[PDB]
Write a protein that binds this ligand. Structure first.
Ligand SMILES: [Zn+2]
Length: 206
């Protein structure tokens, strides 16, 4: 592996930026905490910057290709990712080959602009079994991990699929009175995202 994790001082403005974004994007969900647990705040334990030259060159290369297909604009956004695979991803990069067939927008890798949404997916689809130790989707004890990722969206198709629709690079899923409540984002190519910050945390009891 080429990956090294550099720990950030809570003193650091880089930490405080990611901390602020994570806490501020939390929302009350429709499921009543069923999937991700009940909370309005996290206990931010550790923020590490992920450094891999090969993984970075994979990303910046793809980003250039998208820009030339999208009027010299990458449409780069910083978004959250949640999944069982976080420990794999920080070493090997995103891999679409492990994408899940069932999922509102087909076999892609899902992202959120709301940390609380991405949280729901950490122990699997709709929380799965919950935490390995207590089998509790609302565990306040077991430490969790999200990624705060640099994601190249390109020309994003809006919608309420194996790949992107033609002439598009992503899908922006959108709120729907009989569908989504917040925005999802989906890529169909692992090189269109970089896992930049690894966040270790727990959800807090009100
Ligand atoms: Zn637990």
């Amino acid at each position: 592996s080429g990956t090294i994790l550099i720990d950030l001082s809570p003193d650091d403005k880089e930490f405080q930026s990611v901390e602020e974004e994570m806490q501020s994007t939390v929302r009350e969900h429709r499921d009543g905490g069923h999937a991700g647990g009940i909370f309005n705040r996290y206990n931010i334990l550790k923020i590490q910057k992920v450094c891999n030259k090969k993984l970075w060159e994979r990303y910046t290369h793809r980003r250039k290709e998208v820009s030339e297909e999208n009027h010299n604009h990458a449409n780069e956004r910083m978004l959250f990712h949640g999944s069982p695979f976080v420990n794999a991803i920080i070493h090997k990069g995103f891999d679409e080959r492990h994408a899940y067939i069932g999922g509102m927008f087909g076999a892609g890798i899902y992202f959120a602009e709301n940390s609380s949404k991405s949280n729901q997916y950490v122990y699997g689809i709709g929380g799965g079994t919950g935490c390995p130790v207590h089998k509790d989707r609302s565990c306040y004890i077991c430490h969790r991990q999200l990624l705060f990722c640099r994601v190249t969206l390109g020309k994003s198709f809006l919608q309420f699929m194996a790949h992107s629709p033609p002439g598009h690079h992503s899908v922006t899923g959108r709120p729907s009175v009989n569908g989504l409540a917040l925005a999802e984002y989906v890529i169909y190519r692992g090189e269109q995202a970089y896992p930049e910050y690894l966040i270790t945390y727990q959800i807090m009891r009100p």
